[PDB]
Structures are given as structure tokens and as C-alpha cells.
From Swiss-Prot:
<keyword id="KW-0344">Guanine-nucleotide releasing factor</keyword>
<dbReference type="GO" id="GO:0090630">
    <property type="term" value="P:activation of GTPase activity"/>
</dbReference>
<comment type="subunit">
    <text>Interacts with ELMO2, EPHA2, RAC1 and RHOG; mediates activation of RAC1 by EPHA2. Interacts with TAX1BP3 (via PDZ domain).</text>
</comment>
<protein>
    <recommendedName>
        <fullName>Rho guanine nucleotide exchange factor 16</fullName>
    </recommendedName>
</protein>
<feature type="domain" description="DH">
    <location>
        <begin position="42"/>
        <end position="226"/>
    </location>
</feature>
<dbReference type="GO" id="GO:0030165">
    <property type="term" value="F:PDZ domain binding"/>
</dbReference>
<keyword id="KW-0597">Phosphoprotein</keyword>
<dbReference type="GO" id="GO:0060326">
    <property type="term" value="P:cell chemotaxis"/>
</dbReference>
<feature type="domain" description="PH">
    <location>
        <begin position="259"/>
        <end position="370"/>
    </location>
</feature>
<keyword id="KW-0963">Cytoplasm</keyword>
<feature type="compositionally biased region" description="Basic and acidic residues">
    <location>
        <begin position="1"/>
        <end position="14"/>
    </location>
</feature>
<feature type="region of interest" description="Required for RHOG activation and mediates interaction with EPHA2">
    <location>
        <begin position="33"/>
        <end position="239"/>
    </location>
</feature>
<dbReference type="GO" id="GO:0005737">
    <property type="term" value="C:cytoplasm"/>
</dbReference>
<dbReference type="GO" id="GO:0005085">
    <property type="term" value="F:guanyl-nucleotide exchange factor activity"/>
</dbReference>
<dbReference type="GO" id="GO:0030971">
    <property type="term" value="F:receptor tyrosine kinase binding"/>
</dbReference>
<dbReference type="GO" id="GO:0031267">
    <property type="term" value="F:small GTPase binding"/>
</dbReference>
<feature type="domain" description="SH3">
    <location>
        <begin position="379"/>
        <end position="439"/>
    </location>
</feature>
Length: 455
């Protein structure tokens, strides 16, 4: 009943709208298989899928702990700090998962038909899944650590190749294992939701099922918040140091309430782009926070001199129209400071170099404007499912687990601007990583699911 499968490549039946509980020997021997409703059947199948899935996940965790964390040859290529960050508290995450699995196994063993699993769900989501928060909070660090190690450490690469060629990995890369606790936990509220769907015939148990859905959704949210707070806080301190407000009215950068939305260098335009040259082109670095746009000129890789700023309440952006009838300026747009750092108005004409940069800038700059558009008519939006998991590389991008359902808000030049079904998180990510959902059955059910998961 326990033949291993790596969770990386399993997709639960509980998520949408080869061993089964119907085929279990003790059920095929209790003969209760004819005397039961078509619905109590699907409820027992859901409880069993949570146990089967958690088993595959726990197995995949222990593969990660024995082949790569405990590798002496891998740890020899690193610092003790690099190792700490690369693996985080995966031991504590695993220990939690197994205590969770042991409680679930007990129930399945005691009765052919489980009364309920809802109490275990809620208990563990409130009092034992804290290591998940910590793991999710330090993803920023592990990814960062995994990057430099991948870029600047050849011994690391070689030893990693060799660990990955081993059989227990299944040829899957180390990263596929590190992101496993995030994948698992973000699927848990969906499975607990399936359990709620199949506990409607019963009044008292549906109570506990909804209890547990609330608790597990709070846990996943606490994880998402830990991740955001970690990145946003270090970003604000780092940028506060790097930005020079010497030559403008001082603006204090540090808030509990502030974070970065997008950043990048853009080329400066004159009103008349006609004598423009394509060499020694003037530049403008922009830091757009959630409440303020800051215009700077990059003097160093780690020093930016501030030239202007404006609360985003007072910033307008427009794509610029190509000149009327010769080769003219690529991908232009205009930024209007309505009330800038000196109370005046101001215009900045910029050129990005991709259709997608301009799109991402104009989307970011209308962050305050676009609030209603996403919420008003959600069922109308195309749905898409992510095939490969994606870790976010910029402030505007989004981190996506496998099988995440994403409503699409925009599409330009190989990049999708989307809203995740489960949490409502938004951002950009490349088209390569997702496939269009086409069935109206799915789309509809997934939107109903969205509203029932949301508070």
C-alpha cells in the first residue's frame, strides 16, 4: 500500500473540480462497498488521498535530507552559512510532516471508514506547522544562496550533478526538492476544501471540516506574509542606504507599510526624438514603491542619486504614439508627475527596449488605478494552469507552484500578468510556464472554489 512516488510529479485528484481507497484490501473485505452511498464513498476517497499524498511528500522530503543535506561532499563546497541558508529548517519541516502523517495513519488503521480527519487538520495547522512559515519566509535566502553557488562555485555544480544522477532523486534537480514544502502546504487548503465539499451530507462533521479549512488557510496566509515581510524589509533597508536624497527635499524611505513594486533603468527621451543617437544614450533609473515613484540616476551599482519623486496618487502614465509620416524611438511612454517633490508638475519621456518592459512599467505605474478591474468580473477572465513552477526574479513578478490556477489580466511579449486563484497574489511570469484552461466546466468550478476559499 506504500510504493514510493516523488511528490514533485504527483497531482492530487482533490485539486480539480494508481492506487485507490475503493481498491484497498480491508475495504474489499469489509464488503461495505455495496451498502454505502455514492457520496460517503467520495468522502472516504478524499481522506485517503490526503494520506496517500502526504506519504509521497514525506518520502520526497527524506530523499532531500539524505541525499543532499547530509552529503559531506556537497557541504565541502560551501560555508556553514551558505549551507544553513540553502537548506533552512527542512529537518523541522519534515519532523512536522511525519507527526502529521502518523496521526492520519492512525485514523485510517482504526476504522475501515474514518469518522473524520478535520480535527487533525485544524490541530496541526494551529499548533505544529510553524516550521512551514519559517521555511517559506527564508525562500528568498535559499534561492539567493542557490544562485551564487550555481553561478560562482564549480565544485558545487559537479557534486550536485553527481548527487542528482543518483537513482533516488529520479533525475529531478535539487531545486525540485527544496520547493516541495511550499508546493505541499499551498495544496493543503485545496484538499481540505475537497473534504468540505464531500462532507455536506452530514451537519456536525461539515462543522469540523470548515473549522479546519479556516485554520489551514490561515496557515498558508501566515506563510505568504512571512515571505513578503522578509523580502520587503531587507529591500527597504538596502534601498534606503543606496538612494541619495541629497539634492532634493528629503523623503524618509523606511515604513512598515512600504515596499517596492518595480525597478529598472530606462532611456531618457527628448521631446524631439529626431536627432536621437543610439550611442551614449542618457539613462534614468526608477524605483516605484506602493505609494511613491522615485526618479534617480544610477552613479554606482550601489548608489543612485535622486532627481525627483511623487506619490503614486499623483502619477499618470501614457504609452507614447509613434511619430507621423525613418527609424524612430523603440517602445516609448510618458510619465506625468502631477505633484512632484517641489509641488509642480513634470513630464518624463522614456524608452524601454521590449514591449514587455513597457507593459510592466505601465501596469506597475497604474497599481493604484487598476484596483477595481481585477475584482469586478472575475469569471470572465481566461484561466491558465502552471506547468513548471516559477520563482520570481523581480519585484513585479510572481512565484508560482506547479498546478497553480491563474486568472490572466494581461498578456504581452511572452509575459503574463495574472492573479493566483488561492491567495489573490498578482504578478508577471513568462508564458512558457503555463497552459490555457479551456473547459468552461473547470473555469466555472474554479471560480466558485475561489470565492469559497476567500474569507
Amino acid at each position: 500500500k506504500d510504493d514510493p512516488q516523488l511528490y514533485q510529479e504527483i497531482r492530487e485528484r482533490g485539486l480539480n473540480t494508481q492506487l485507490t481507497w475503493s481498491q484497498l484490501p480491508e475495504v474489499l473485505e469489509s464488503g461495505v462497498l455495496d451498502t454505502l452511498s455514492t457520496e460517503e464513498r467520495k468522502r472516504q476517497e478524499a481522506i485517503f488521498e490526503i494520506l496517500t499524498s502526504e506519504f509521497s511528500y514525506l518520502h520526497s522530503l527524506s530523499i532531500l535530507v539524505t541525499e543532499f543535506l547530509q552529503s559531506r561532499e556537497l557541504r565541502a563546497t560551501m560555508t556553514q552559512t551558505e549551507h544553513h541558508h540553502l537548506f533552512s529548517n527542512i529537518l523541522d519541516v519534515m519532523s512536522a510532516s511525519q507527526k502529521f502523517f502518523e496521526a492520519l495513519e492512525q485514523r485510517h488503521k482504526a476504522q475501515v471508514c474514518v469518522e473524520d480527519i478535520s480535527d487533525i487538520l485544524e490541530d496541526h495547522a494551529q499548533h505544529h506547522f510553524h516550521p512551514y512559515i519559517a521555511y517559506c519566509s527564508n525562500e528568498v535566502y535559499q534561492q539567493r544562496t542557490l544562485q551564487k553557488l550555481s553561478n560562482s562555485n564549480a565544485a558545487f555544480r559537479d557534486v550536485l550533478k553527481e548527487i542528482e544522477k543518483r537513482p533516488a532523486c529520479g533525475g529531478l534537480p535539487m531545486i525540485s526538492f527544496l520547493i516541495l514544502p511550499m508546493q505541499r502546504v499551498t495544496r493543503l487548503p485545496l484538499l481540505t476544501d475537497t473534504l468540505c465539499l464531500k462532507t455536506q451530507g452530514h451537519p456536525e462533521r461539515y462543522k469540523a471540516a470548515s473549522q479546519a479549512l479556516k485554520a489551514i488557510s490561515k496557515l498558508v496566509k501566515q506563510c505568504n506574509e512571512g515571505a513578503h515581510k522578509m523580502e520587503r524589509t531587507e529591500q527597504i533597508y538596502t534601498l534606503n542606504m543606496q538612494l541619495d536624497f541629497g539634492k532634493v527635499k528629503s523623503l524618509p524611505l523606511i515604513s512598515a507599510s512600504r515596499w517596492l513594486l518595480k525597478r529598472g533603468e530606462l532611456f531618457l527621451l527628448e521631446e524631439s526624438s529626431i536627432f536621437r543617437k543610439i550611442a551614449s544614450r542618457p539613462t534614468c533609473y526608477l524605483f516605484l514603491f506602493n505609494d511613491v515613484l522615485v526618479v534617480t540616476k544610477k552613479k554606482s551599482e550601489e548608489s543612485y542619486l535622486v532627481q525627483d519623486y511623487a506619490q503614486l496618487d499623483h502619477v499618470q502614465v501614457r504609452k507614447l504614439e509613434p511619430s507621423e509620416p525613418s527609424s524612430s524611438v523603440p517602445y516609448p511612454f510618458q510619465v506625468n508627475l502631477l505633484h512632484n517633490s517641489e509641488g509642480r508638475q513634470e513630464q518624463i519621456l522614456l524608452s524601454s527596449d521590449s514591449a514587455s518592459d513597457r507593459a510592466r512599467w505601465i501596469t506597475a505605474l497604474t497599481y493604484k488605478e487598476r484596483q477595481w478591474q481585477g475584482i469586478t468580473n472575475k469569471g470572465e477572465l481566461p484561466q491558465v494552469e502552471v506547468t513548471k513552477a516559477y520563482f520570481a526574479k523581480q519585484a513585479d513578478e510572481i512565484t508560482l507552484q506547479q498546478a497553480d490556477i491563474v486568472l490572466v489580466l494581461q498578456e504581452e511579449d511572452g509575459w503574463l500578468h495574472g492573479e493566483r486563484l488561492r491567495d489573490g497574489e498578482t504578478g508577471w511570469f513568462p508564458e512558457s510556464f503555463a497552459h490555457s484552461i479551456t473547459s468552461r466546466v473547470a473555469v466555472e468550478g474554479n471560480v466558485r472554489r475561489m470565492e469559497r476559499l476567500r474569507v
